[PDB]
CSV table of C-alpha atoms in Angstrom, one decimal:
chain,number,residue,atom,x,y,z
A,54,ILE,CA,73.9,-136.5,176.0
A,55,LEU,CA,74.0,-140.3,175.5
A,56,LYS,CA,76.4,-140.8,178.4
A,57,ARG,CA,78.4,-139.3,181.2
A,58,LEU,CA,81.5,-141.5,181.4
A,59,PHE,CA,82.9,-140.1,184.6
A,60,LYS,CA,82.2,-140.2,188.4
A,61,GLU,CA,81.7,-136.7,189.8
A,62,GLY,CA,84.6,-135.5,191.9
A,63,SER,CA,86.9,-138.1,190.3
A,64,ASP,CA,90.4,-137.8,188.7
A,65,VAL,CA,90.3,-137.6,184.9
A,66,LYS,CA,93.2,-137.8,182.4
A,67,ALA,CA,93.8,-135.3,179.6
A,68,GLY,CA,92.0,-136.5,176.5
A,69,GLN,CA,89.7,-139.0,178.3
A,70,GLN,CA,86.1,-139.0,177.2
A,71,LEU,CA,83.7,-137.4,179.7
A,72,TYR,CA,80.6,-137.5,177.5
A,73,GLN,CA,79.2,-139.2,174.5
A,74,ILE,CA,76.9,-137.0,172.6
A,75,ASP,CA,74.5,-139.2,170.6
A,76,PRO,CA,76.6,-139.9,167.4
A,77,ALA,CA,73.9,-141.6,165.3
A,78,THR,CA,72.8,-138.7,163.2
A,79,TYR,CA,76.5,-137.5,162.9
A,80,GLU,CA,77.5,-141.0,161.8
A,81,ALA,CA,74.8,-140.9,159.2
A,82,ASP,CA,76.0,-137.5,157.8
A,83,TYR,CA,79.5,-138.7,157.7
A,84,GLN,CA,78.8,-142.0,155.9
A,85,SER,CA,76.4,-140.4,153.5
A,86,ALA,CA,79.1,-137.7,152.7
A,87,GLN,CA,81.5,-140.5,152.0
A,88,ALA,CA,79.1,-142.3,149.6
A,89,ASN,CA,78.5,-139.1,147.7
A,90,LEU,CA,82.2,-138.6,147.6
A,91,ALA,CA,83.0,-142.2,146.4
A,92,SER,CA,80.5,-141.7,143.5
A,93,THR,CA,81.5,-138.1,142.5
A,94,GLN,CA,85.2,-139.0,142.8
A,95,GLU,CA,85.0,-142.0,140.5
A,96,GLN,CA,83.1,-139.9,137.9
A,97,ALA,CA,85.7,-137.0,138.2
A,98,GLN,CA,88.5,-139.5,137.6
A,99,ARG,CA,86.7,-141.1,134.6
A,100,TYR,CA,86.1,-137.6,133.1
A,101,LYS,CA,89.7,-136.4,133.7
A,102,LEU,CA,90.8,-139.3,131.5
A,103,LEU,CA,88.1,-138.6,128.9
A,104,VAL,CA,88.8,-134.9,128.6
A,105,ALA,CA,92.5,-135.9,128.1
A,106,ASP,CA,91.3,-138.1,125.2
A,107,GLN,CA,88.8,-135.3,124.0
A,108,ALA,CA,86.1,-137.8,124.5
A,109,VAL,CA,84.3,-135.1,126.7
A,110,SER,CA,84.1,-131.2,126.7
A,111,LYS,CA,85.9,-129.0,129.2
A,112,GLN,CA,82.5,-128.1,130.7
A,113,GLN,CA,81.6,-131.8,131.4
A,114,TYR,CA,84.9,-132.4,133.1
A,115,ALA,CA,84.4,-129.0,135.1
A,116,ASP,CA,80.9,-130.1,136.3
A,117,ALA,CA,82.2,-133.5,137.4
A,118,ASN,CA,85.2,-131.9,139.1
A,119,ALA,CA,83.0,-129.3,140.9
A,120,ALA,CA,80.7,-132.1,142.3
A,121,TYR,CA,83.7,-134.0,143.6
A,122,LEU,CA,85.1,-130.8,145.4
A,123,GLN,CA,81.7,-130.3,147.1
A,124,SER,CA,81.8,-133.9,148.3
A,125,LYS,CA,85.4,-133.7,149.5
A,126,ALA,CA,84.4,-130.7,151.5
A,127,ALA,CA,81.2,-132.3,152.9
A,128,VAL,CA,83.2,-135.2,154.1
A,129,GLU,CA,85.8,-133.2,156.0
A,130,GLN,CA,83.2,-131.1,157.8
A,131,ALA,CA,81.2,-134.3,158.7
A,132,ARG,CA,84.3,-136.0,160.0
A,133,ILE,CA,85.0,-133.0,162.3
A,134,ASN,CA,81.4,-133.0,163.7
A,135,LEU,CA,81.5,-136.8,164.3
A,136,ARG,CA,84.8,-136.3,166.2
A,137,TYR,CA,83.2,-133.8,168.4
A,138,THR,CA,80.5,-136.3,169.7
A,139,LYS,CA,83.2,-137.6,172.1
A,140,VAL,CA,83.5,-134.6,174.6
A,141,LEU,CA,87.0,-135.0,176.0
A,142,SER,CA,89.0,-133.7,179.0
A,143,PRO,CA,91.2,-130.8,178.0
A,144,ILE,CA,93.5,-131.6,181.1
A,145,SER,CA,94.3,-134.1,183.8
A,146,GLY,CA,92.7,-133.2,187.1
A,147,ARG,CA,89.8,-133.6,189.5
A,148,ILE,CA,86.5,-133.1,187.6
A,149,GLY,CA,83.6,-131.8,189.7
A,150,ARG,CA,79.9,-132.1,189.1
A,151,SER,CA,78.1,-132.4,185.8
A,152,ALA,CA,75.9,-129.3,185.1
A,153,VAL,CA,74.2,-131.7,182.6
A,154,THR,CA,72.2,-134.9,183.1
A,155,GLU,CA,72.1,-137.8,180.6
A,156,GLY,CA,69.4,-137.2,178.0
A,157,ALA,CA,69.8,-133.4,178.1
A,158,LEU,CA,70.1,-131.2,175.0
A,159,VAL,CA,73.5,-129.4,174.5
A,160,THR,CA,74.2,-126.7,171.9
A,161,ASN,CA,77.5,-125.6,170.2
A,162,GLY,CA,78.2,-122.2,171.7
A,163,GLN,CA,75.8,-122.5,174.7
A,164,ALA,CA,76.8,-120.0,177.5
A,165,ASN,CA,77.4,-122.5,180.3
A,166,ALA,CA,80.2,-125.2,180.7
A,167,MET,CA,79.1,-128.8,181.3
A,168,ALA,CA,81.9,-129.6,183.8
A,169,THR,CA,85.2,-128.1,185.1
A,170,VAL,CA,88.4,-130.0,185.6
A,171,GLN,CA,91.1,-128.8,188.2
A,172,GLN,CA,94.6,-129.8,188.3
A,173,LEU,CA,95.2,-130.1,192.0
A,174,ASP,CA,98.3,-132.2,192.4
A,175,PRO,CA,100.9,-129.4,192.0
A,176,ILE,CA,98.8,-126.8,193.8
A,177,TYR,CA,99.3,-123.0,194.1
A,178,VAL,CA,99.4,-120.9,197.2
A,179,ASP,CA,98.8,-117.3,196.3
A,180,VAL,CA,100.7,-114.9,198.5
A,181,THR,CA,99.9,-111.2,198.5
A,182,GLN,CA,102.6,-108.8,199.9
A,183,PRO,CA,103.5,-105.1,199.6
A,184,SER,CA,105.9,-104.4,196.7
A,185,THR,CA,108.7,-103.7,199.1
A,186,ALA,CA,108.5,-107.0,201.0
A,187,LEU,CA,108.9,-108.8,197.6
A,188,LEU,CA,111.9,-106.7,196.5
A,189,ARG,CA,113.5,-107.5,199.8
A,190,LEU,CA,113.0,-111.2,199.4
A,191,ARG,CA,114.3,-111.3,195.8
A,192,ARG,CA,117.5,-109.7,197.0
A,193,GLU,CA,118.0,-112.5,199.6
A,194,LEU,CA,117.7,-115.1,196.9
A,195,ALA,CA,120.7,-113.5,195.1
A,196,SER,CA,122.4,-112.7,198.5
A,197,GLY,CA,122.0,-116.5,199.4
A,198,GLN,CA,120.3,-115.6,202.6
A,199,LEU,CA,117.3,-117.6,201.3
A,200,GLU,CA,117.6,-121.1,200.2
A,201,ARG,CA,116.8,-121.7,196.5
A,202,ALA,CA,114.3,-124.3,195.1
A,203,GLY,CA,115.3,-124.3,191.4
A,204,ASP,CA,115.4,-121.2,189.2
A,205,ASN,CA,114.1,-117.9,190.6
A,206,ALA,CA,112.5,-119.6,193.6
A,207,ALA,CA,112.9,-119.9,197.4
A,208,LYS,CA,112.3,-123.1,199.3
A,209,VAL,CA,109.2,-122.8,201.4
A,210,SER,CA,107.1,-124.6,204.1
A,211,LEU,CA,103.4,-124.6,204.5
A,212,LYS,CA,101.4,-124.2,207.6
A,213,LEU,CA,97.8,-125.4,207.3
A,214,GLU,CA,94.7,-123.6,208.8
A,215,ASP,CA,94.4,-126.3,211.6
A,216,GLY,CA,97.9,-124.8,212.5
A,217,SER,CA,99.8,-127.9,211.7
A,218,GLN,CA,102.8,-128.2,209.3
A,219,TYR,CA,102.3,-129.5,205.8
A,220,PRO,CA,104.8,-132.4,205.4
A,221,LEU,CA,106.1,-131.6,202.0
A,222,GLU,CA,107.9,-128.3,201.2
A,223,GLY,CA,107.4,-126.1,198.1
A,224,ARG,CA,108.7,-123.4,195.8
A,225,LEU,CA,108.1,-119.7,196.2
A,226,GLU,CA,108.4,-118.3,192.7
A,227,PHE,CA,109.4,-114.7,192.3
A,228,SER,CA,107.8,-113.6,189.1
A,229,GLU,CA,104.7,-111.6,190.1
A,230,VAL,CA,101.5,-112.6,188.6
A,231,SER,CA,99.5,-109.5,189.6
A,232,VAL,CA,99.8,-106.1,191.1
A,233,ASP,CA,96.7,-104.8,193.0
A,234,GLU,CA,94.7,-101.7,192.2
A,235,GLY,CA,94.3,-99.6,195.4
A,236,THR,CA,97.3,-101.0,197.4
A,237,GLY,CA,100.6,-101.3,195.6
A,238,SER,CA,100.4,-105.0,196.8
A,239,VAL,CA,101.8,-107.8,194.7
A,240,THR,CA,100.7,-111.4,194.3
A,241,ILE,CA,103.2,-114.2,193.8
A,242,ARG,CA,102.8,-118.0,193.9
A,243,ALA,CA,104.2,-120.9,195.8
A,244,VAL,CA,103.9,-124.4,194.3
A,245,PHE,CA,103.4,-127.4,196.6
A,246,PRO,CA,103.2,-131.1,195.7
A,247,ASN,CA,99.7,-132.6,196.5
A,248,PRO,CA,100.0,-136.4,195.8
A,249,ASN,CA,97.0,-137.2,198.0
A,250,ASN,CA,94.6,-134.4,197.8
A,251,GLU,CA,95.0,-132.9,201.3
A,252,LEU,CA,95.2,-129.4,199.8
A,253,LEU,CA,92.1,-128.0,198.2
A,254,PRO,CA,91.5,-124.6,196.5
A,255,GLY,CA,90.1,-122.1,199.0
A,256,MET,CA,92.1,-123.0,202.1
A,257,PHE,CA,93.8,-120.1,204.0
A,258,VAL,CA,97.4,-121.0,204.8
A,259,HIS,CA,100.8,-119.8,205.8
A,260,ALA,CA,103.9,-120.1,203.6
A,261,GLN,CA,107.1,-120.1,205.6
A,262,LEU,CA,110.5,-118.7,204.8
A,263,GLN,CA,113.7,-119.5,206.7
A,264,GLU,CA,116.0,-116.4,206.5
B,212,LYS,CA,114.6,-93.7,195.9
B,213,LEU,CA,112.3,-96.5,196.8
B,214,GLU,CA,109.5,-96.8,199.4
B,215,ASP,CA,111.9,-98.6,201.7
B,216,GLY,CA,114.2,-95.6,201.6
B,217,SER,CA,116.8,-97.5,199.4
B,218,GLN,CA,118.6,-96.2,196.4
B,219,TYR,CA,117.8,-97.7,193.0
B,220,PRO,CA,121.2,-98.4,191.3
B,221,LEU,CA,120.2,-97.3,187.8
B,222,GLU,CA,119.3,-93.7,187.0
B,223,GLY,CA,116.9,-92.4,184.5
B,224,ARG,CA,115.7,-89.4,182.6
B,225,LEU,CA,113.1,-86.9,183.7
B,226,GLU,CA,111.3,-85.7,180.7
B,227,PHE,CA,109.9,-82.2,180.8
B,228,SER,CA,107.1,-82.5,178.2
B,229,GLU,CA,103.8,-82.5,180.1
B,230,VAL,CA,101.6,-85.6,179.9
B,231,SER,CA,98.6,-84.2,181.7
B,232,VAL,CA,97.3,-81.2,183.6
B,233,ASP,CA,94.9,-81.3,186.4
B,234,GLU,CA,91.4,-79.7,186.4
B,235,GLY,CA,90.9,-77.9,189.7
B,236,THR,CA,94.4,-78.3,191.1
B,237,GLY,CA,96.1,-77.1,187.8
B,238,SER,CA,99.1,-79.3,188.8
B,239,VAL,CA,101.0,-81.0,186.0
B,240,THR,CA,102.1,-84.6,185.6
B,241,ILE,CA,105.4,-85.5,184.0
B,242,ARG,CA,107.3,-88.7,183.8
B,243,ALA,CA,110.7,-90.2,184.3
B,244,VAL,CA,111.9,-93.3,182.5
B,245,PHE,CA,114.1,-95.7,184.4
B,246,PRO,CA,115.8,-98.9,183.0
B,247,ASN,CA,114.4,-102.0,184.8
B,248,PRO,CA,116.3,-105.0,183.5
B,249,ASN,CA,115.8,-107.2,186.6
B,250,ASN,CA,112.3,-106.7,187.3
B,251,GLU,CA,112.9,-104.9,190.5
B,252,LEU,CA,110.4,-102.1,189.8
B,253,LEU,CA,106.7,-103.0,189.3
B,254,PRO,CA,103.7,-100.5,188.7
B,255,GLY,CA,102.2,-98.7,191.7
B,256,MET,CA,105.2,-98.2,193.8
B,257,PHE,CA,105.6,-94.9,195.8
B,258,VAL,CA,108.9,-93.4,195.1
B,259,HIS,CA,110.9,-90.2,194.9
B,260,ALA,CA,112.8,-89.0,191.9
B,261,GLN,CA,116.0,-87.2,193.0
B,262,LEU,CA,117.2,-84.2,191.2
B,263,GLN,CA,120.5,-82.2,191.7
C,54,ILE,CA,90.2,-122.0,173.7
C,55,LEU,CA,92.2,-125.1,172.8
C,56,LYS,CA,95.5,-124.0,174.4
C,57,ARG,CA,96.9,-121.3,176.5
C,58,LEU,CA,100.5,-121.5,175.4
C,59,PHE,CA,102.1,-118.9,177.8
C,60,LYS,CA,103.1,-119.1,181.5
C,61,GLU,CA,101.3,-116.5,183.6
C,62,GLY,CA,103.6,-113.7,184.8
C,63,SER,CA,106.2,-114.2,182.0
C,64,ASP,CA,107.7,-112.2,179.2
C,65,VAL,CA,106.2,-112.4,175.8
C,66,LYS,CA,107.1,-110.8,172.5
C,67,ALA,CA,105.0,-108.6,170.2
C,68,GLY,CA,103.5,-111.0,167.7
C,69,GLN,CA,103.9,-114.1,169.9
C,70,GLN,CA,101.0,-116.7,169.9
C,71,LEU,CA,99.3,-116.6,173.3
C,72,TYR,CA,96.3,-118.8,172.5
C,73,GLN,CA,95.0,-121.4,170.1
C,74,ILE,CA,91.3,-121.0,169.4
C,75,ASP,CA,90.1,-124.5,168.1
C,76,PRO,CA,90.8,-124.0,164.3
C,77,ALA,CA,89.3,-127.3,162.9
C,78,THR,CA,86.1,-125.9,161.3
C,79,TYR,CA,87.9,-122.7,160.3
C,80,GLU,CA,90.6,-124.8,158.6
C,81,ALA,CA,87.9,-126.8,156.8
C,82,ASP,CA,86.0,-123.7,155.6
C,83,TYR,CA,89.1,-122.2,154.3
C,84,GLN,CA,90.3,-125.3,152.4
C,85,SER,CA,87.0,-125.9,150.9
C,86,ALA,CA,86.5,-122.2,149.9
C,87,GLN,CA,89.9,-122.2,148.3
C,88,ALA,CA,89.2,-125.3,146.2
C,89,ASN,CA,85.8,-123.9,145.1
C,90,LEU,CA,87.6,-120.6,144.0
C,91,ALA,CA,89.9,-122.6,141.7
C,92,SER,CA,86.9,-124.2,140.2
C,93,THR,CA,84.6,-121.1,139.8
C,94,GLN,CA,87.6,-119.1,138.5
C,95,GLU,CA,88.4,-121.5,135.6
C,96,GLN,CA,84.7,-121.7,134.8
C,97,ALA,CA,84.4,-117.8,134.7
C,98,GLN,CA,87.6,-117.6,132.6
C,99,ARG,CA,86.3,-120.2,130.2
C,100,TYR,CA,82.9,-118.6,129.8
C,101,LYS,CA,84.5,-115.3,129.2
C,102,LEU,CA,86.2,-116.8,126.1
C,103,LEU,CA,83.1,-118.7,125.2
C,104,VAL,CA,80.8,-115.6,125.1
C,105,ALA,CA,83.2,-113.8,122.8
C,106,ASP,CA,82.6,-116.8,120.5
C,107,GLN,CA,78.8,-116.7,121.1
C,108,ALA,CA,79.0,-120.3,122.3
C,109,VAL,CA,77.2,-119.2,125.6
C,110,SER,CA,75.0,-116.1,126.4
C,111,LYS,CA,75.8,-113.0,128.6
C,112,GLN,CA,73.5,-114.4,131.3
C,113,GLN,CA,75.6,-117.6,131.5
C,114,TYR,CA,78.8,-115.6,131.7
C,115,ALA,CA,77.2,-113.1,134.2
C,116,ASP,CA,76.3,-116.1,136.4
C,117,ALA,CA,79.7,-117.7,136.1
C,118,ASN,CA,81.5,-114.4,136.9
C,119,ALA,CA,79.1,-113.8,140.0
C,120,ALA,CA,79.8,-117.3,141.4
C,121,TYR,CA,83.5,-116.6,141.0
C,122,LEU,CA,83.2,-113.2,142.8
C,123,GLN,CA,81.4,-114.9,145.7
C,124,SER,CA,84.2,-117.5,145.9
C,125,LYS,CA,86.8,-114.8,146.1
C,126,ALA,CA,84.9,-113.1,148.9
C,127,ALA,CA,84.4,-116.4,150.7
C,128,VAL,CA,88.1,-117.2,150.6
C,129,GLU,CA,89.1,-113.8,152.0
C,130,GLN,CA,86.8,-114.0,155.0
C,131,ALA,CA,87.8,-117.7,155.7
C,132,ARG,CA,91.4,-116.7,155.6
C,133,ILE,CA,90.9,-113.8,158.0
C,134,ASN,CA,89.0,-116.0,160.4
C,135,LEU,CA,91.6,-118.8,160.2
C,136,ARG,CA,94.3,-116.2,161.0
C,137,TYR,CA,92.5,-115.0,164.1
C,138,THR,CA,92.4,-118.5,165.6
C,139,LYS,CA,96.0,-117.7,166.7
C,140,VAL,CA,95.7,-115.0,169.3
C,141,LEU,CA,98.8,-112.9,169.3
C,142,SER,CA,100.5,-110.5,171.8
C,143,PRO,CA,100.1,-106.9,170.5
C,144,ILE,CA,103.4,-105.9,172.2
C,145,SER,CA,106.4,-107.3,174.0
C,146,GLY,CA,106.2,-107.2,177.8
C,147,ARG,CA,105.2,-109.1,180.9
C,148,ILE,CA,101.9,-111.0,180.7
C,149,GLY,CA,99.9,-111.6,183.9
C,150,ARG,CA,97.1,-114.0,184.6
C,151,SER,CA,94.9,-115.6,181.9
C,152,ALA,CA,91.3,-114.4,182.6
C,153,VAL,CA,90.0,-117.1,180.3
C,154,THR,CA,90.8,-120.8,180.8
C,155,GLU,CA,91.3,-123.7,178.3
C,156,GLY,CA,88.1,-125.0,177.1
C,157,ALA,CA,86.5,-121.6,177.5
C,158,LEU,CA,84.3,-120.1,174.9
C,159,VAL,CA,85.3,-116.8,173.4
D,54,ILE,CA,85.6,-154.5,135.5
D,55,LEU,CA,88.2,-154.5,138.2
D,56,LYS,CA,89.2,-158.2,137.7
D,57,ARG,CA,88.5,-161.2,135.5
D,58,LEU,CA,89.4,-164.1,137.9
D,59,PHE,CA,88.9,-166.8,135.2
D,60,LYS,CA,91.1,-168.2,132.4
D,61,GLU,CA,89.3,-168.3,129.0
D,62,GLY,CA,88.6,-171.8,127.8
D,63,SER,CA,88.9,-173.2,131.4
D,64,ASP,CA,86.4,-175.1,133.6
D,65,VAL,CA,84.3,-173.3,136.2
D,66,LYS,CA,81.9,-174.2,139.1
D,67,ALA,CA,78.4,-172.8,139.7
D,68,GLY,CA,78.7,-169.9,142.1
D,69,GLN,CA,82.4,-169.4,141.3
D,70,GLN,CA,83.2,-165.7,141.1
D,71,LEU,CA,84.0,-164.8,137.4
D,72,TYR,CA,84.5,-161.0,137.6
D,73,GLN,CA,84.8,-158.3,140.2
D,74,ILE,CA,83.0,-155.1,139.4
D,75,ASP,CA,84.4,-152.1,141.3
D,76,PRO,CA,82.7,-152.2,144.6
D,77,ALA,CA,83.9,-148.8,146.1
D,78,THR,CA,80.7,-146.9,145.4
D,79,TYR,CA,78.5,-149.9,146.3
D,80,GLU,CA,80.4,-150.5,149.6
D,81,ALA,CA,79.9,-146.9,150.6
D,82,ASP,CA,76.2,-146.8,149.5
D,83,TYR,CA,75.7,-149.8,151.7
D,84,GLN,CA,77.6,-148.4,154.7
D,85,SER,CA,75.6,-145.2,154.3
D,86,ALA,CA,72.2,-147.0,154.1
D,87,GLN,CA,73.1,-148.9,157.3
D,88,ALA,CA,74.1,-145.7,159.0
D,89,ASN,CA,70.8,-144.0,158.0
D,90,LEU,CA,68.8,-147.0,159.3
D,91,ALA,CA,70.5,-147.0,162.7
D,92,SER,CA,70.0,-143.3,163.1
D,93,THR,CA,66.5,-143.3,161.8
D,94,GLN,CA,65.4,-146.4,163.7
D,95,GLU,CA,66.6,-145.0,167.0
D,96,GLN,CA,64.7,-141.8,166.4
D,97,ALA,CA,61.5,-143.6,165.7
D,98,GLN,CA,61.9,-145.8,168.8
D,99,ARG,CA,62.6,-142.5,170.7
D,100,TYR,CA,59.5,-140.7,169.2
D,101,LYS,CA,57.3,-143.8,169.8
D,102,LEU,CA,57.9,-143.3,173.5
D,103,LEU,CA,57.6,-139.5,173.3
D,104,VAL,CA,54.3,-139.6,171.5
D,105,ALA,CA,53.2,-142.1,174.2
D,106,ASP,CA,53.5,-139.4,177.0
């Protein structure tokens, strides 16, 4: 790790660079592959014209074309490895702590992540309820007894753990995401805007439905 | 008939081919198939099949 | 995992792509294997003619043929691996949560 | 010979470029030699410190 380019606990954009793996040796392989390619390519081109003129054998053209194909290949792999020296954010979100300190050794396929990014703005609230409660509620969306928030969703309010109301108002989406093992109990999700990060994963809360 | 005591509007077939027999109990499991085009039914619900 | 590609708790179809494993190296291996095949094949074909004419030995042809066989094998495995970078649904139905996130290692 | 650059029979100045030989391979050898130097120089700096401790 040459560098960590982010502040722990900050907001990162999708595709932003979070680390620079030391590119020097990867730059060297790439540039060296291209030099080998520039040479073998020019030869293969020369020989293609000669074999057309029967100024060289099929074998000699073959050997030149083989070397060129090897070089072409070596470039493409080296290009990919070089690209990977910039470790990028897969998503926009709040990145946490680095499990890795500058100057540490990282390995392709190492068991542990280096960081974890969490999209927090739209945030979920997982609600678990008996299968029958959910069937009831779904009917009221079609009955019109419950107010809709877009397709297949009821308008909802949130009550924080400190007991207060959350100011914003969400969506309670009716496609189940899991059914539980022992209990027949079903988990669905509400979706609340979180434009300043008042809501954080792990909070216990109350979603509220007006019937 | 659903856990809530309500009637499912659709109607299925109860198939008499045995899927499994129990060890000690010796009691058989068979299965009905019901259409479920709105996804009203989910796995793990306690229900009663009604036969005439 | 480069991409997840499905909404959790939604309907998917048999054969639908659910994930994109990063294919970049697999793509490169396959392209390069394929180009090597074209080249060892013509060489083996040519030496096959040339041995009949006693312009090369049996050992030279045996080596050319061997290299060609390895290329065939390399191409088939590279193709299969490349194909698996697209993780498909085995059946049509409702998918639940993803147990694996983007950026995860599989 | 990529290019001639001069008219036969004409007048020329010392240091005037008279031909261009194809530089593609030469450019890339040079780029690659710089890249190897950078990489290799950093490593020897690094190992100079390492061997120190």
